[PDB]
């Protein structure tokens, strides 16, 4: 399999910037969602999920084909709750129908991040919708009840090393877990709609208590009212992960640089960018444009 990036016919930077602005304006307006968290989080999750199905071995999965739009994928149990981000984007797609699905799902993720004060994430267009039969089977997304070995192992399928994994996981500071969705419940910290290194701080400074929740699943709960999944917790159990957590707990910039590179890589896995391809775009935030 080769997925070559193909620019949507005749579109350019400015075209993309408008999709971005549209997404951002909607994020701004629909702030009541999930009790005032806003849709930032969910979109980030969405972007990650359409991309985590990737298999470095045979190049199936990944964000290129927008397969999430098909039943198989859309109905994947690991994707429960994502339908709300989809619905959020639907009107957008209506407004700019020439954008591919994979471009759109991934763009929301980027938009989200940057709108929530995170770092700028360069992004590339070119994804191409693929047929229903390209939709990967369910089960390619990781489980939360495991440990560090699982995580290392899992992420390797995506070519991500230890540093990437830890950076990437720092997104856990956002939003929260929801009972109905994954059998987990609770936020991980206080600023759950603004992008910070809070994740790492929490993991290191709170006093975590292992407990079972209402779905009969175990989770690490803190006095402050926060939670961490076992997979999150596992970043402190592994010596190698641990030193990284510590690094980011100490330097928000490092964290941002690292996250930025990783997230893009994550969203570009399995895609071949030809030579003539435009460079990656760096979008302006609403605020940068005074809108
Ligand atoms: C071991 C790896 C991962 C596991 C097992 C994990 C699994 C989960 C779980 C169980 C949920 C809660 C869903 C719900 O009930 O709403 C979720 C929340 C979330 N996931 Fe992950 N995830 C991990 C990797 C990632 C990474 C790489 C990203 C993005 C870079 C990410 C971003 C998020 C976000 C932003 C939320 C909050 C969603 C909301 O507020 O609706 N996670 N994670």
Swiss-Prot record:
Subunit structure: Forms a one-to-one complex with cytochrome c.
Site (Transition state stabilizer): 45
Source taxonomy: Eukaryota, Fungi, Dikarya, Ascomycota, Saccharomycotina
Ligand binding (heme b): 172
Enzyme Commission no: 1.11.1.5
Modified residues (Phosphotyrosine): 150
Cofactor annotation comment: Binds 1 heme b (iron(II)-protoporphyrin IX) group per subunit.
Full-sequence range covered: 71 to 361 of 361
Cellular compartments per GO CC: mitochondrial intermembrane space; mitochondrial matrix; mitochondrion
Chain's role: Destroys radicals which are normally produced within the cells and which are toxic to biological systems.
Family to which this protein belongs: Belongs to the peroxidase family. Cytochrome c peroxidase subfamily.
GO process annotations (BP): cellular response to oxidative stress; hydrogen peroxide catabolic process; response to reactive oxygen species
Localization terms from the record: Mitochondrion matrix; Mitochondrion intermembrane space
Protein name: Cytochrome c peroxidase, mitochondrial
Entry keyword set: Heme, Hydrogen peroxide, Iron, Metal-binding, Mitochondrion, Organic radical, Oxidoreductase, Peroxidase, Phosphoprotein, Transit peptide
Record: active site: 49 (proton acceptor), 188 (tryptophan radical intermediate)
Reaction catalysed by this enzyme: 2 Fe(II)-[cytochrome c] + H2O2 + 2 H(+) = 2 Fe(III)-[cytochrome c] + 2 H2O
Entry's Gene Ontology molecular function annotations: cytochrome-c peroxidase activity; heme binding; metal ion binding; peroxidase activity
Cofactor: heme b
Keyword flag Lyase: no
Primary location class: mitochondrion
Post-translational modification: CCP1 precursor is processed by the rhomboid protease PCP1, which cleaves the N-terminal hydrophobic transit peptide. The m-AAA protease (composed of YTA12/RCA1 and YTA10/AFG3) is required for CCP1 maturation: m-AAA protease promotes membrane dislocation of the CCP1 transmembrane segment within the transit peptide to ensure the correct positioning of CCP1 within the membrane bilayer, allowing intramembrane cleavage by PCP1.
General remark: Present with 6730 molecules/cell in log phase SD medium.
UniProt enzyme class: oxidoreductase
């Amino acid at each position: 399999l080769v997925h070559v990036a193909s620019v949507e016919k005749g579109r350019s930077y400015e075209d993309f910037q408008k999709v971005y602005n549209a997404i951002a304006l909607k994020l701004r307006e629909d702030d009541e969602y999930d009790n005032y968290i806003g849709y930032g989080p969910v979109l980030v999750r969405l972007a990650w999920h359409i991309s985590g199905t990737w298999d470095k071995h045979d190049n199936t999965g990944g964000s290129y084909g927008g397969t999430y739009r098909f039943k198989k994928e859309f109905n994947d149990p690991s994707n429960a709750g994502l339908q709300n981000g989809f619905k959020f984007l639907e009107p957008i797609h209506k407004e700019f129908p020439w954008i591919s699905s994979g471009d759109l799902f991934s763009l929301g993720g980027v938009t989200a991040v940057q709108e929530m004060q995170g770092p700028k994430i360069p992004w590339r267009c070119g994804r191409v919708d693929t047929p229903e039969d390209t939709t990967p089977d369910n089960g390619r997304l990781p489980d939360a009840d495991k440990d560090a070995g699982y995580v290392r192992t899992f992420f390797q399928r995506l070519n991500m090393n230890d540093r990437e994994v830890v950076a990437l996981m720092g997104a856990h500071a956002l939003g929260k877990t929801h009972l109905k969705n994954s059998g987990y419940e609770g936020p991980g910290g206080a600023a759950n709609n603004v992008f910070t290194n809070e994740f790492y701080l929490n993991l290191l400074n709170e006093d975590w208590k292992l407990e079972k929740n209402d779905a009969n699943n175990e989770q690490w709960d803190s006095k402050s009212g926060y939670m961490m999944l076992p997979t999150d917790y596992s970043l402190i159990q592994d010596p190698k992960y641990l030193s990284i957590v510590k690094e980011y707990a100490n330097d928000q910039d490092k964290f941002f640089k690292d996250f930025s590179k990783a997230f893009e890589k994550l969203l570009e896995d399995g895609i071949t960018f030809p030579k003539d391809a435009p460079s990656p775009f760096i979008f302006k935030t609403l605020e940068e444009q005074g809108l």
